[PDB]
Amino acid sequence: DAEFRHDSGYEVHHQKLVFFAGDVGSNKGAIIGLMVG
Amino acid sequence: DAEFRHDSGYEVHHQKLVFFAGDVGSNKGAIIGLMVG
Amino acid sequence: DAEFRHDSGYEVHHQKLVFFAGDVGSNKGAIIGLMVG
Amino acid sequence: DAEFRHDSGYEVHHQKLVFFAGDVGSNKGAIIGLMVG
Amino acid sequence: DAEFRHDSGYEVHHQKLVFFAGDVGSNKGAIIGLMVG
Amino acid sequence: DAEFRHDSGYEVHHQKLVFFAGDVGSNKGAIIGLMVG
């Protein structure tokens, strides 16, 4: 009687003034904050 | 009697002044904040 | 008597002044904040 | 005289017998191949 | 006279018998190949 | 006269019998190949 189990568990985030936040994987692009000429 | 289980679990986010937020996977593009000429 | 279960769980988001927010997968485009000439 | 340019470029994919393929932002779910009881 | 440029460039993929392939941002889930009871 | 440039460059991939392939940001889950009871 093979039992299995998993739990990705409890998280919590409190953020403020955050230009970017999260997970990406691949970026061939340009996550620019501000350009000027 | 093979039992299984999973739980992606409890989360919470409190954000403010956040130009971008979340998950992407792939970006071949251009996540620009501001361009000027 | 094989039991299974899943729960994608409880979330909550409170946001303000957020140019973009959410999940994308693929971007071949251009998520521009502001262009000027 | 401000020139810009971008090119997400040229790609090619040849696949076979591929249970899943592509880009995902977030998965709180269960991309299972096969369950049995 | 401010010039800019970008090029995410030229790619090629040839695959076969690939249970999963691509880019992921976040997985709170379960990308299982095969479960049995 | 401020010039800039970028080039994410030229790539090539030739694969076969590859259970998983690509880029991941976060995994709180379970990228299992095969479970048995």
Author numbering:
A (entry chain B), B (entry chain B), C (entry chain B), D (entry chain A), E (entry chain A), F (entry chain A): 1 to 37
What's the paper's own text on this?
We also determined the cryo-EM structure of Aβ filaments from the brains of AppNL−G−F mice to 3.5 Å resolution. Filaments are made of two identical S-shaped mutant protofilaments that extend from D1 to G37 of Aβ. Each protofilament consists of five β-strands that extend from residues 1 to 8, 10 to 16, 17 to 19, 30 to 32 and 34 to 36. Additional densities around K16 may be co-factors or post-translational modifications of mutant Aβ, but their chemical identity remains unknown. The N-terminal segment (residues D1–F19) is longer than in human Arctic folds A and B, allowing it to fold back on the common substructure and extend across the dimeric interface towards the other protofilament. Both protofilaments pack against each other with pseudo-21 symmetry. The central portion of their interface is made of residues D23, G25 and S26 from both protofilaments and resembles the doublet-forming interface of human Arctic protofilaments A and B. At the edges, both protofilaments pack against each other through the hydrophobic side chains of A2 and F4 from one protofilament and A30, I32 and M35 from the other. In addition, there are salt bridges between E11 and K28, and close contacts of the side chains of H6 and S8 with the backbone atoms of G29 and K28, respectively. It shares the substructure F20–G37 with human Arctic folds A and B, in which the backbone conformation of the loop F20–V24 differs from human Arctic folds in that the orientation of the peptide group between A21 and G22 is reversed. Flipping the peptide group does not affect its ability to form additional hydrogen bonds with other Aβ molecules, but places G22 in the glycine-only quadrant of the Ramachandran plot.
The Arctic mutation, encoding E693G in the amyloid precursor protein (APP) gene [E22G in amyloid-β (Aβ)], causes dominantly inherited Alzheimer’s disease. In summary, we report the structures of Aβ filaments from a case of AD with the Arctic mutation and from mouse knock-in line AppNL−G−F. These findings have implications for our understanding of AD pathophysiology. Comparison of local conformations in this region revealed the presence of additional hydrogen bonds between adjacent Aβ molecules in mutant protofilaments; these hydrogen bonds cannot form in wild-type protofilaments, providing a plausible explanation for the increased fibrillogenesis of E22G Aβ. Mutation E22G may have an additional fibrillation-promoting effect, which is the relief of electrostatic repulsion as a result of removal of the negatively charged carboxylic group of E22; in the wild-type structure, E22 is trapped in close proximity to the carboxylic group of D23.
